Amino acid sequence: ATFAQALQFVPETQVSLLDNGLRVASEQSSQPTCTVGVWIDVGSRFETEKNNGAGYFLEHLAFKGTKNRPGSALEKEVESMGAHLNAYSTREHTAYYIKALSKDLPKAVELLGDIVQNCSLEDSQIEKERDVILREMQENDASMRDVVFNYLHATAFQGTPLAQAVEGPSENVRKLSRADLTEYLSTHYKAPRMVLAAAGGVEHQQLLDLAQKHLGGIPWTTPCRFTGSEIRHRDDALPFAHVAIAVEGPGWASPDNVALQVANAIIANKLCQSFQTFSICYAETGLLGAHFVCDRMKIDDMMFVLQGQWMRLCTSATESEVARGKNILRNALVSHLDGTTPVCEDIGRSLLTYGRRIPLAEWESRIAEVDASVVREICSKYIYDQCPAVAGYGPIEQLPDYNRIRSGMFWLRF
Amino acid sequence: REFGNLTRMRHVISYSLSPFEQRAYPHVFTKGIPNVLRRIRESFFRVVPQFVVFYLIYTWGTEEFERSKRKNPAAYEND
C-alpha cells in the first residue's frame, strides 16, 4: 500500500450532464453522512460597479425565504433534520451546500433547488439584510488580514472587475434595489453554469434523480491586467503592521501551478511574527506571493528575507528543498481532501474550474514531474524581475518604498 | 532616527504606481508646459525687478564712467 498505490483506492467522481446543462457530480463512499451542494460560476468579477454587492446580498437573503416555504419554515426544516446549511461567495464562485445525513439526501437536494430556482426576495427582508450588511462592514473593518487582501486585489487589478471586493461599497449595497438582484439572478443563476456536487453516503443515480426532479427547471438558455501598483494605509495606532506582496500568477488552467505550489511550500518566521505564502488562482490571472505581520521596527528585515528566499528559489534551488516541498504539497493535498465537506467543495470547484475532477493520481504524477530545474525555471518565469503589487495596512513607515521593493526583485550578483 | 519611529500619522492612505507601468513624461503639453509657465509667472514679478534695477545701475555707471574721461572742452578753450 504505497502512496501511489493508495491513491488508486480513491473512488472516482461520477459526472452526468442534464438536459438543461446542470452538471451533477458525486463521489460515493461508505460514509453515514453527506454534504450536497450547488456551485455556481458567478462571483464579484462578473459584477459591474452598478451591482458590485449583488452576490453577497443574495447570499445573505438566500436562506431568508423562498416561494414554496417562508424563511422561518426553511430554517426550521433545515434544523429539524439536524443538517447545517452554509454558503460562501468568492470573486469567481458562489456555493450553497447542505451538510446532512445520507438518508436525508432526498430532502436536502430539494432544498437546494428551492434556494436556487425560486428565491423569495421579500422587501422587508431586503431592508433587514441591508442593515445586517451595513453592520457587517464595521465588523469586517476589524479584520486586518481581510482588509490587506482587499487592498492587494484592488491595487493589483485596478481597472478590472477582478479588483472590486465581494461585499462591495457601502453606497452600492445601500442603493442596491430588488430589481437589480432579480436581474442578477436571471442573468447569472442559470445552467449549465451550475454543478450539483455531493460526496459521502450518496449513490450517484439517486443524486441524478433528485437533480432532475428539483434542479431540472432551471432555464436551459474585459482583459484582466495585473498592474504592479501599491496601496499604503497607515493608521499608526494599530499594534502590528500587515503586509501582502504578490506578483501575477497563472490562471487555473496552467501546468505551472504545481511548481508554484512546491515553491511556496519551500518558502524563517523568526524575523517575522506570522508569515504565510499564498497562491490565489483565478481563471486567467492570479496572485502568487506572501503575507506577513510585522513589528513596527522590523518590516524591512522581513521583506528582505522574503525577497531573498524568492531570489534563492529563482536562481539556485537545490534538489533536497524541492523534494521537501513536493512532500509537503502531497501531504497538504491529501490531508485537505479528508472530510466530506472538503471533497464536495473540491468536486464543485474543480468542475467549475478545470471542467473535470482531476484525480489524485494525476496530481501525484504532476508533482513527480516537478524538479529543481523546473522550480528554478518557473520561479524565474513568474517571480524574478517582476513588478509586484504591494498592500500595507499600517503602521507602515519602515516598509521599503516601491522602488526599493521592485529593486529587491532581482539580484545584481546573478 | 530610523524610518520605523519618526512620527505618528493616522489613516493616511496613498496609492502609487510602478515606474515601469507609467510613463516618464506624462502631460508634457497638457499640464507640464502650463505648470512651468505659471511657476515662471509667479516668480517673475518677485525676482526680475531687482535685476532690472541692477542692469539700469550697471548701464548708467558705465556710461557715466565713459563720459567722465571724454570731457574738458572749456578747460582748454580758455587758452
If you write DSSP's letter for every residue of B4-23 in order, what string do you get? TSS----S-EEEE--TTTS-
Residues A378/A259, Cβ–Cβ less than 8 Å: yes
Resolution of the structure in the document, Å:
3.0
Give the Cα separation of A280 and A353 in Å (integer). Answer: 13
Closest residue to B9, CB basis, from A236, A298, A402: A236
Closest of A322, A294, A321, A319 to residue A306, by C-alpha:
A294
Q: Please, which residues have CB within 8 angstroms of residue A16's CB and are 6 or more apart in sequence?
A: A23, A24, A25, A204, A208
CB contact under 8 A, B19 and A155: no
Cell of A125: 427582508
- Per the CB < 8 A criterion, the answer to whether B34 and B27 are in contact is no
Cα–Cα distance between A71 and A76 in angstroms, integer?
8
| Interchain CB distance below 8 Å, B21 and A228 | yes
Residue A279's contacts (CB-CB under 8 Å, 6 or more residues apart) are A249, A257, A260, A261, A264, A286, A287, A288
Pairing of strands A230-233, A389-393: parallel
Could you tell me the sign of the dihedral formed by the alpha carbons of A259, A260, A263, A265, in that order?
A: negative
Chain B residues with CB-CB distance to A under 8 A?
2-6, 8-21
CA-wise closest residue to A35 among A81, A117, A110, A102: A102
- Grid coordinates of B26: 506624462
Residue A222 near residue A249, CB atoms below 8 Å: no
Residue A142 C-alpha cell reads as 476589524
Instruction: Return d(Cα B54, Cα A255) in angstroms, integer.
Output: 76
Longest dimension (CA), chain B: 93
For residue B59, the SS3 value is helix
Short-list A114, A354, A87, A321, CA closest to A218? A114
Closest CA to A396 of B18, B3, B1: B3
How far apart CA A279 and CA A247 sit, in angstroms, is: 10
8 Å CB contact between A334 and A359:
no
The DSSP 8-state label assigned to residue B29 in this structure reads I
User: Between B4, B13, B18, which is nearest A397 by CB?
Assistant: B4
Residue A35 neighbours by CB under 8 Å, 6+ apart: A97, A98, A99, A100, A198, A199, A200, A340, A341, A344
Torsion of CA A55, A58, A62, A64, to 10 degrees: 150
Nearest CA among A295, A51, A75, A67 for reference residue A188: A51
Contact B18 A231 (CB under 8 A): no
A83: left (phi over 0), alpha (psi -120 to 50) or beta: beta
- Residue A167 bears catalytic tag: no
Catalytic option among A59, A75, A77, A110 = A59
Which DSSP state fits B27? T
Nearest by CB: A237 against B4, B10, B16: B10
What distance in Å separates the CA atoms of residue A410 and residue A383, rounded to the nearest whole number? 9
Q: Are strands A241-248 and A389-393 parallel, antiparallel or unpaired?
A: antiparallel
Dist. CA A272–CA A46, nearest whole Å: 37
SS (HEC) of chain A: CCHHHHHCCCCCCEEEECCCCCEEEEEECCCCEEEEEEEECCCHHHCCHHHCCHHHHHHHHHCCEECCCEHHHHHHHHHHCCCEEEEEECCCCEEEEEEEEHHHHHHHHHHHHHHHCCECCCHHHHHHHHHHHHHHHHHHHHCHHHHHHHHHHHHHHCCCHHHCCCCCCHHHHHCCCHHHHHHHHHHHCCCCCEEEEEEECCCHHHHHHHHHHHCCCCCCCCCCCCCCCEEEECCCCCCCEEEEEEEECCCCCCCHHHHHHHHHHHCCCCCCCEEEEEEEECCCCEEEEEEEEECCCCHHHHHHHHHHHHHHHHHCCCHHHHHHHHHHHHHHHHHHCCCHHHHHHHHHHHHHHCCCCCCHHHHHHHHHHCCHHHHHHHHHHHCCCCCCEEEEECCCCCCCCHHHHHHCCCCCCC
Per-residue cell: A53: 454587492
| Cell numbers that stand for A248 in this block | 501575477
- Alpha carbons A301 and A306: distance in angstroms, whole number: 9
The residues, ordered by sequence, that sit 6+ positions from A211 with a Cβ below 8 Å of its Cβ are: A18, A22, A24, A109, A196
Q: How far is A286 from chain B (nearest CA, A)?
A: 18
Residue A233 has a CB neighbour count (10 Å cut-off) of 18
d(CA A163, CA A141): 18
Crossing angle for the helix pair A319-336 and A256-266, to the nearest 10 degrees? 100
Q: What distance, in Å, lies between the first and last C-alpha atoms of chain A?
A: 45
- Burial (CB < 10 A; 0-12, 13-18, 19+), residue B42, is exposed
CA distances in angstroms from A14 to A97, A191, A343, A356, listed in the order given: 19, 19, 13, 10
How many C-beta atoms surround the C-beta of residue A272 within 10 A? 21
Q: Is residue B40 helix, strand or coil?
A: helix
Amino acid at A344: C
Distance (Å, rounded) from C-alpha A344 to C-alpha A311?
A: 37
* Contacts with A163 from chain B: Cβ below 8 Å: none
> CA–CA separation, A132 vs A138, rounded Å?
10
d(CA A382, CA A250): 8
Other C-beta atoms lying within 10 Å of the C-beta of residue A325: 24
